[PDB]
Structures are given as structure tokens and as C-alpha cells.
Enzyme design. Structure first.
Site, mmCIF file in Angstrom:
data_model
loop_
_atom_site.group_PDB
_atom_site.id
_atom_site.type_symbol
_atom_site.label_atom_id
_atom_site.label_comp_id
_atom_site.label_asym_id
_atom_site.label_seq_id
_atom_site.Cartn_x
_atom_site.Cartn_y
_atom_site.Cartn_z
ATOM 1 N N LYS A 218 0.847 -1.693 0.012
ATOM 2 C CA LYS A 218 -0.276 -0.068 -0.363
ATOM 3 C C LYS A 218 1.047 1.017 -0.198
ATOM 4 O O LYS A 218 0.354 2.433 -0.383
ATOM 5 C CB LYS A 218 -0.645 0.050 1.370
ATOM 6 C CG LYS A 218 -1.925 -0.809 1.627
ATOM 7 C CD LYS A 218 -2.438 -0.884 -0.106
ATOM 8 C CE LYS A 218 -4.450 -1.780 0.536
ATOM 9 N NZ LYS A 218 -3.546 -3.061 0.109
HETATM 10 C C1 LIG Z 1 -4.315 -4.047 0.462
HETATM 11 C C2 LIG Z 1 -4.002 -5.272 0.706
HETATM 12 C C3 LIG Z 1 -4.172 -6.467 0.274
HETATM 13 C C4 LIG Z 1 -4.685 -6.436 -1.107
HETATM 14 O O1 LIG Z 1 -4.248 -5.975 -2.487
HETATM 15 P P1 LIG Z 1 -5.192 -4.912 -3.485
HETATM 16 O O2 LIG Z 1 -4.056 -3.934 -4.520
HETATM 17 O O3 LIG Z 1 -6.201 -3.703 -2.808
HETATM 18 O O4 LIG Z 1 -5.391 -5.991 -4.056
HETATM 19 C C5 LIG Z 1 -3.810 -7.429 0.368
HETATM 20 N N1 LIG Z 1 -3.099 -7.923 1.742
HETATM 21 C C6 LIG Z 1 -2.811 -6.626 2.252
HETATM 22 C C7 LIG Z 1 -2.463 -7.243 3.720
HETATM 23 C C8 LIG Z 1 -3.316 -5.820 1.885
HETATM 24 O O5 LIG Z 1 -3.034 -4.643 2.419
#
Ligand SMILES: *Cc1c(COP(=O)(O)O)cnc(C)c1O
Ligand code: HEM
Ligand code: HEM
Ligand SMILES: *Cc1c(COP(=O)(O)O)cnc(C)c1O
Lengths: 496, 496
Positions: free
Chosen positions: B79
Site C-alpha cells: 500500500k
Molecule cells: C490492500 C492489501 C491487499 C490487497 O491489495 P489490493 O491492491 O487492494 O488488491 C492484500 N494484503 C494486504 C495486507 C493489503 O493491505
């Protein structure tokens, strides 16, 4: 008689000015990583150098402050370097055969590196660490498949009970087991000599003024300072020792009452063989308060998530670097991440509990921080029985003009919350039926409050929870969320 | 009326085969970072790809299994990428002025990235996250200077109580505040498109067979899968959705009883606008047990310190990649580190508490001695001393009687701790204490009680937390046990 003093004098014949060609030690130079790493162990090294923007200027430093962030290593500590090296060298010597047990005394970072490498390479890992060190380390280590043994923090390294002692005695009791011995092993400061220093030089182009490092085993500062005295001899080397450690010089610095400190990973009651103190231009003493204040400051201001060791280091840096002038630069070593420390210096209650925070420093808080909940003025909500249905709930809530009903009981036990929006959403989405039991739609998680509570406490609860119910010691006087508090404060912003 | 549905249909006119020159969106291509990063924010990206050695072969995959480990990012999650991007783009539009409040709903990784960026750049950060999410996240966030609001986890995205809703309301109550909205914002999947995918191609040379990604907001799998369909069109794209989430296809897969799950970061009750489900060749449903089992397996076997999300992803990978044959490869995305999950799936007691571990299995994994009584050690009865006794007398008594270590008891019968000959001697000899001094200065305070009818395994755990375990009745100590005693026992049995 099997033990080997970690404080033994160094037999190394190295001295400043010796041609690098005279070294008996086997050197491996840094290389370029393949596109695809064959295992995570190759992710060790090549840590980024990062300019410190706010903090350097805060304390009046005119110079450029750089930090080598070593918590980006696989294990997340600087020790991952010396672990890997120590093992690889040990493999070349034929000393360490696959399927052999490794035993190490550690502050726990080296233990992590080793346990990691062992998990990968199939070695059996046994760690010995003092009982002071954080439980997060234990967690990670145990997850790696390492067996764990602890020693009293109060034990002197001479004594059998110290980590070194226990380690050696285990080594005596385990067949085909080795102790790499980071205190006596050339591979540690060598690993810092061949790689870390090169990285810093290359990153600085070779132009560097001052270098600050906290010293646990000396390996870092040893290798670094040696290669620096060679390649960039004009660089001052600054050691950092915690009060209660005998490492610094002159000995006048070590005169102190307390024998123990909270910071993990630095300081010792003895002088490790791998430590060359003659290469250290000056020593500085750091305490716990300094360390944690600067680590928290480092996270909050600079966004560097790092250990308290780093805190100590920078804490010294802002002092020692004062003599420098603009155009120059000072590099600081940040040993590890917050991952080990999660429940200690990161937790405000632990910082308060240990006396590193005066409650008065209430100073930082916004104006509303001390006020009663009563001042919000609230309202009295409507309560329903758990046996009530969804439909009837909607009916009542709309009829009475209320968005949210706490679900109470005839016994008087509050079971939770229901809300009109979520009820509607659920029914409308076919998740529930109008005849269905509230018990689903219900919000189970909430927290109690007294009218005489302070708004700050409310803020904390709201950091952990959505709903706060005001109560006595049975009945609910009101319902509070973050938004309510915000409405209040904002309303007060307009009232000036 | 201010809210904007995060589930709104996508207005994007992109379709497969469109020349990239038609894109209205502003793209920034990956570049080479300078030797010295001007701030930690530039440390986002260029995450390493790593071969999975043990597990792929464990489950019978004939192919090469790669993992893009995204937890080496600054904030330690994937993220962080979309965080930086979202801000930078927002800065280009002039939409985000310095000194403006940011509000975001998140599973908390996005929140961490944002809090980090805000901390660096002076923005004020307000996070809204469900009450399911780990407290470690909260801790990091609070350390970053972010304000935190929680929402009920069971709340429907429609409802006022959901994170998105609360976020928007806050936006209504705060002057000059923005919501970057990771669900509707182009910058998220764009960030995965421009950089992450490019990185993957470059690391694989452009040759790739299968790609497995778990989907929370879809941004990752969308950006990546798009750039992949463009550049390496023969690659299968596999989505991973938790049971209880409606994301997958066909809808027949989403039919399930339970509405909630322990895994953080993936799955939703709605379809995010940035998610393009049309680029997903197949979906797989994962559960919690799978996830955590594979996460723990991932740490222990592969030395990858990673979140449970990653666990889900690989748990799917070992299935989906079965059709592949040797010479091919499957790249798996690993979203975050253990730093967030420290007290949850890493802790065995939490895994037992939540029913992801049957004690039978733990008893199966354990070595033979694991269930045995302490009594079987046979021990010995130690010698006890009063706390008012001096050091000298302690040494005298101990040598005279031929004992290394004595428990310090009370007339009252309360055991105050331990003293040992080695540490006493070391202490005196080092001049820390005097022969006429009271024992307490040398005394070892920390220990743990045990019953003869306790199991040796319990002992192993305690020894993971403590140096001394005193076997006692309900004023009498039947014995004193350390790791070494246990080891003497086991070794003697190995010998016979
Ligand atoms: C947000 C996130 C995901 C998924 O990623 P996306 O781009 O939203 O599909 C998976 N694992 C964790 C820990 C995340 O924070
Ligand atoms: C011209 C360079 C050097 C020379 C000639 C040299 C030579 C030696 C010799 C002869 C020994 C003793 C060997 C033994 O008894 O096992 C030794 C030990 C050692 N050296 Fe060096 N050395 C050099 C540079 C370095 C450097 C640069 C480092 C660290 C950065 C280093 C770290 C050590 C250590 C840790 C030991 C072990 C000390 C001990 O076991 O007591 N040496 N060296
Ligand atoms: C030639 C390529 C593309 C073209 C022409 C295009 C065109 C558009 C247009 C016209 C919009 C509506 C803008 C608005 O009303 O705000 C839009 C929105 C959007 N696009 Fe693209 N796009 C392209 C590629 C992509 C790619 C590759 C991605 C990500 C992988 C992407 C993600 C998005 C998103 C998230 C939105 C916002 C959706 C919305 O506002 O409803 N686009 N695009
Ligand atoms: C070991 C360590 C240090 C000290 O590094 P040395 O090379 O031994 O001087 C500092 N901080 C932490 C967290 C460490 O693990």
C-alpha cells in the site's frame, strides 16, 4: 576446560598503513544481485542511505545528516549481515557441516539472522539471550524454528549463567554443535569491512566528514572505521555507549551508579575481542531517555521505523556533529526496526510506566483534552430487547426518529448496538429477514464511559472502538462516536 | 448529499488492444534512485523477486515459483506504493495543498503509507479502519502522528457505520479536507500499472506463465493484469478472495454461511470501482486456516517474514500452479510483513484460541520427551539461604557444602530469587560488591514456578521465557531446573 573469553585481547596484527595485500583473512567483495534472488538471504545488504531533513535542522546542525538504514535487511537488523557472513566463512573452512547445530549468544538480532539463515539452509538453531530482551524477538525466533534459552540480565559474563557461559555449556552438551562467536569471530567486523563501508563510501562518492555508530560488539564500528581510515582518513569516528557499559574511553566516562539500562543491543560489561577501540576518535555516552525520545522523534518526524539503538545513535549525532559546518556531512548508523520493540518504547503506557514520560508533557494535547463528557450534552437513547425483530426495530427507530438503539436486556446486561442504516442495508440486501432476530445485525463491540470521564480518554477509546456508551455502576446515559466529538470540537471552533 | 459509492461502475474506456497513447491519465515511468535518498519516501518500490525453494516442491509443483516481496517497502506493505502515488498525483492537480487534512478509510496498510507520507510532508492524517484490524497497526499509526477512528467490522458499506461512510462524514465536518479514496482513485491501479508490473517484467525478462494475487481493492491485480495483458499476453491472472467476500466469479463460489474472516487486507462486501474483474482469468477462494498455515509455513520454510494475506496467496498458488509443467513459472504477490500481525497468527496461543490449530497436531510434531513429568528428571533438593546473609558467607557456605547455586528464601517462606557462586565471585572480584555486603545486590530476581506433575514441554516454554524454573510444593523447593539440566537428561537418554 572449555570456555573462550570473549574479552580476550586481539591477536590481530592489523595496523593503520598496512598494505591491504598483507591480510591473511579471506575477503569477499560486494557484487551485483541477479534479477531473481535464489533465496531471501541474498536480500541482505545494499541498504539505502537517507537524508535526515527535519531533525538535523531542529537541533541546530548546519551540516548534512545521512542515515544508513539497516532495518531494510531481511531480518530487519544489521546483524543479518554478520550472520550470513559468519556462516558462509564457516562453510568454507569446512568447520560447519550441513545438519549441524548452531548455538549463539545474542542481543537477539544476530540470533534472528542466524535463525533465519538456518531455516533456509536446514541448520538447527539454538539461541541464548538475556531475559531483558523483548518478547517480539522471541516470537519471530520461535516462528523461525529456533530453540530458545534465556539468561539472567544481571549475570556477569564471567559467571556460568551469562549468555556466553550458558552457550558454551550447551555446546559442551550437544554433539556436532558449533558456536560462531560474534565476539571473537573475524567474520563479523570483516563483514562490516568488505561491504557496509564500501556501500557508505560509494553512496557518499567517497567524501565523508563524521560517522556516528553505537557499539554493541564493535564489529560495525570496527570494520567501518578501519576501511574508512584507509579510504577516507579524514573521517572522525564517533562511538556511542549506553551508561552502565564500560566500553567507552576515557574510563572517566563509565563512572556511574546504575548497572542496567533498557535499550537493547548495545553496551556490555566486557570488551569484545572484535572491538578495536583505537580506531574510535571519540566516545559519547547515551541514556535510555535520550534513545527512546529520539527514536520516537525519528519515526514521527522522519518516518524511519527503527529501533531504540538508532535512537541512541542519532541522539549522540545531534551533539557530536555540532562542530561541523555547512557543506559537510555526517553519516549515522541505524541498526534495526521497530518490529522488535512493538510493545515497549512504541507503547506510551510503557514509556510512562518506565518514567521516560512525564504526564505533564498534557502540554502536547489540544485544548479539549481535559474536559468532561458531560460538556458534550449528549442525549438519552432508546433501548430495545434482544428478542425484538429486525422489522420491528426499523419501525420503532423510524417512528421515534432515532438512528441507533443500544440493545439491552431485562437482566440489564448491554448486549450491543443496532442501527437503522445497517438494518436497512442488511434487509435490502437480503442478508436478514424482518422476522429475524436482532442478534445477526448487532454490533457487539463497544466501551463504557462515565459522565465524569475526560474527553481524551474518549479519544483513546475511539482509537480502539467505534461506540462509547456512557454508564453507571447498569443503565446507559448516551452514545458517542468519533463524529460526535468532532461535531462538538468543530462547533467550538466556530464559537471563537 | 455528499457520499460517493466506492462500488460505482467504472467509467474507464480502456479495453484490451487500445494503444497506450490514447490514455488521458498521466503516467510516470520508473527511474533510477540517486545514491542518497532525499527522504525515506523514495525507498518505496524496486521490491525484490525471490524464488520459493522448499514449499513449491513440497506441494508437487513442477514449475519455478517466484514471490514479489513487497514488504521491503518503507511502510512495509504494498500500500505504500499507491500511497505515494495518490499524493503526488493529488499534488499535480493542485487538489492537495500543503497543510491540508487527509482522511482515508483503510484496512490499515494504506493508512500506514499515508500516515508516513504525511509525517514526512507535514500533512495532517486521519485514518479510519475497522475494529477487526490488528492493534500493531494502530500502534505504528499512532507513532506516526496519525489520528485514528475505528468502525464496526460488521458494518455494511452502505451503512453510516462503515469506514467509508465515517470517512466521508468526517470529510463533511472538517474544513479543507480531502479523501483520496483508494477505491475510486485511478492513481492506485495506475501505480500498480506503471511500476510494479514493469518491475515484474524486467525481473522475469518478460517471460511469465501464471500470476497469483489476492485482491483487497483490486488495484494491484488490475494494474498488473492490464500491463501484463498488454506486454506478456499469455499470462494467466489468478485472483484470491477470502470466503465471505463477494469479489470472486462466478457468483456460485461466493455462496457461504459465515460473513466474516480473520485475514486482514483482502475481501470486501462490495466491488471497488478500480477493480476490473474482466482481466481475472480465474478466481480462487481461500480461508483463514489455509492462510495462516501457509504464512507460518512461509516464514519457517522460506524465511519470508510476511503477512497472512501472502499466506492466502501462496495457499492458492500451490493449487492453481499445478497445471503448469517444468520450465514455466508462477509469480506470487506478497503484500505485507509480520510487523502488523505480531500478536495474532504468529502467536501459537492465538492460533489455538481461534481453532486454527488442533492440539493433537502439536503433540504429533513434538519430540518424545515432550510429555513427561519433571519428576522423571529426579532432580535434587537445593540449599536455601536468608536474604540478610552477606556475600562472603554465601561463598563460604556454597563451597563448603559443594553447591553452585542457592535459592534465597524468607523466614516467611517467600522465595526472593537466586544466588550463584559464579556471579557472586565475579561480582566481588570485579569490585562491584563487598564481602560484608547484603546478598540482594547480586541476587537474581526473575524466575518461574513449576510442579513435579508438570510436563517437560511446559518446562521448555518457560525456559523460552526464563532462566530458572523452581520445582515447588504448596515453602519447599523440590528442585531447580535450567535448560542445561533438561539437556543433561535428554542427552543421557540419547546416549542410551
Ligand atoms: C490492500 C492489501 C491487499 C490487497 O491489495 P489490493 O491492491 O487492494 O488488491 C492484500 N494484503 C494486504 C495486507 C493489503 O493491505
Ligand atoms: C593487513 C591486514 C591484516 C592483517 C595482516 C591481519 C593479520 C591477523 C593475524 C595474523 C591474526 C591472528 C590470526 C590467528 O591467530 O588466528 C588476526 C586475527 C584477527 N583479525 Fe586481522 N589482520 C588484518 C586486517 C584485519 C581487519 C581489517 C579486521 C577487521 C575489520 C581484522 C579482524 C581480525 C580478527 C577479529 C581477528 C581475530 C582476533 C583473535 O582471534 O584474537 N583483521 N589478524
Ligand atoms: C488507453 C487507456 C485508457 C484510457 C483511454 C482511459 C480513459 C479513461 C476515462 C475517459 C476515464 C473517466 C475519467 C473521469 O470521468 O474521471 C477513466 C477513468 C479511470 N481509469 Fe482509465 N483509461 C485508460 C487506461 C487505464 C488504465 C490502464 C487503468 C488502470 C489499470 C485505468 C484506471 C482508471 C480509473 C481507476 C479510472 C476512474 C474510474 C472512474 O472515475 O469511474 N485506466 N479512464
Ligand atoms: C548488535 C546491535 C547493535 C550494535 O552493533 P555492533 O556491530 O555490535 O556494534 C546496535 N543495535 C542493535 C539493535 C544491535 O542488534
Amino acid at each position: 576446560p572449555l570456555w573462550i573469553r570473549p574479552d580476550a585481547p586481539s591477536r590481530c596484527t592489523w595496523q593503520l598503513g598496512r598494505p591491504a595485500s598483507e591480510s591473511p583473512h579471506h575477503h569477499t567483495a560486494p557484487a551485483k544481485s541477479p534479477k531473481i534472488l535464489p533465496d531471501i538471504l541474498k536480500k541482505i545488504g545494499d541498504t539505502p542511505m537517507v537524508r535526515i531533513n527535519k531533525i538535523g535542522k531542529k537541533f541546530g546542525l548546519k551540516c548534512e545528516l545521512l542515515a544508513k538504514c539497516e532495518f531494510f535487511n531481511a531480518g530487519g537488523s544489521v546483524k543479518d549481515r554478520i550472520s550470513l557472513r559468519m556462516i558462509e566463512d564457516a562453510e568454507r573452512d569446512g568447520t560447519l557441516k550441513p545438519g549441524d547445530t548452531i548455538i549463539e549468544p545474542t542481543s537477539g538480532n544476530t540470533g534472528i539472522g542466524l535463525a533465519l539463515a538456518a531455516a533456509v539452509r536446514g541448520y538447527r538453531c539454538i539461541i541464548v539471550m538475556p531475559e531483558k530482551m523483548s518478547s517480539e524477538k522471541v516470537d519471530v525466533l520461535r516462528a523461525l524454528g529456533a530453540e530458545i534459552v534465556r539468561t539472567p540480565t544481571n549475570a556477569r559474563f564471567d559467571s556460568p549463567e551469562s549468555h556466553v557461559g550458558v552457550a558454551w555449556r550447551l555446546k559442551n552438551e550437544i554433539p556436532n554443535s558449533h558456536i560462531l562467536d560474534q565476539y571473537r569471530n573475524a567474520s563479523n567486523p570483516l563483514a562490516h569491512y568488505d561491504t557496509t563501508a564500501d556501500e557508505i563510501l560509494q553512496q557518499c562518492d567517497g567524501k565523508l566528514d563524521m560517522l556516528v555508530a553505537s557499539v554493541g560488539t564493535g564489529g560495525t564500528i570496527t570494520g567501518i572505521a578501519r576501511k574508512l581510515k584507509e579510504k577516507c582518513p579524514g573521517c572522525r569516528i564517533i562511538g556511542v555507549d549506553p551508561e552502565g557499559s564500560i566500553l567507552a574511553e576515557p574510563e572517566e566516562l563509565n563512572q556511574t551508579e546504575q548497572t542496567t539500562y533498557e535499550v537493547e543491543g548495545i553496551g556490555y560489561d566486557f570488551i569484545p575481542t572484535v572491538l578495536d577501540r583505537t580506531v574510535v576518535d571519540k566516545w559519547f555516552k547515551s541514556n535510555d531517555e535520550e534513545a527512546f525520545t529520539f527514536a520516537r522523534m525519528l519515526i514521527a518526524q522522519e518516518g524511519l521505523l527503527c529501533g531504540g539503538s538508532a535512537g541512541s545513535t542519532v541522539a549522540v549525532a545531534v551533539k557530536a556533529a555540532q562542530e561541523l559546518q555547512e557543506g559537510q556531512r555526517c553519516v549515522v548508523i541505524l541498526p534495526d526496526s521497530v518490529r522488535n520493540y512493538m510493545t515497549k518504547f512504541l507503547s506510551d503506557r510503557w514509556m510512562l510506566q518506565k518514567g521516560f514520560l512525564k504526564e505533564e508533557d498534557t502540554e502536547k494535547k489540544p485544548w479539549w483534552w481535559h474536559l468532561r463528557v458531560q460538556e458534550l450534552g449528549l442525549s438519552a437513547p432508546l433501548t430495545v430487547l434482544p428478542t425484538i425483530t429486525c422489522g420491528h426495530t426499523i419501525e420503532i427507530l423510524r417512528e421515534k426518529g432515532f438512528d441507533q438503539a443500544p440493545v439491552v436486556d431485562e437482566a440489564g446486561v448491554i448486549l450491543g448496538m443496532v442501527t437503522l442504516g445497517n438494518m436497512l442495508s442488511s434487509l435490502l440486501a437480503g442478508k436478514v429477514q424482518p422476522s429475524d432476530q436482532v442478534g445477526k445485525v448487532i454490533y457487539k463491540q463497544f466501551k463504557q464511559i462515565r459522565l465524569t470521564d475526560t474527553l481524551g480518554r474518549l479519544s483513546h477509546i475511539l482509537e480502539m472502538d467505534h461506540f462509547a456508551l456512557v454508564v453507571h455502576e447498569q443503565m446507559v446515559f448516551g452514545v458517542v462516536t468519533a463524529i460526535d466529538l468532532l461535531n462538538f470540537v468543530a462547533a467550538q471552533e466556530r464559537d471563537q
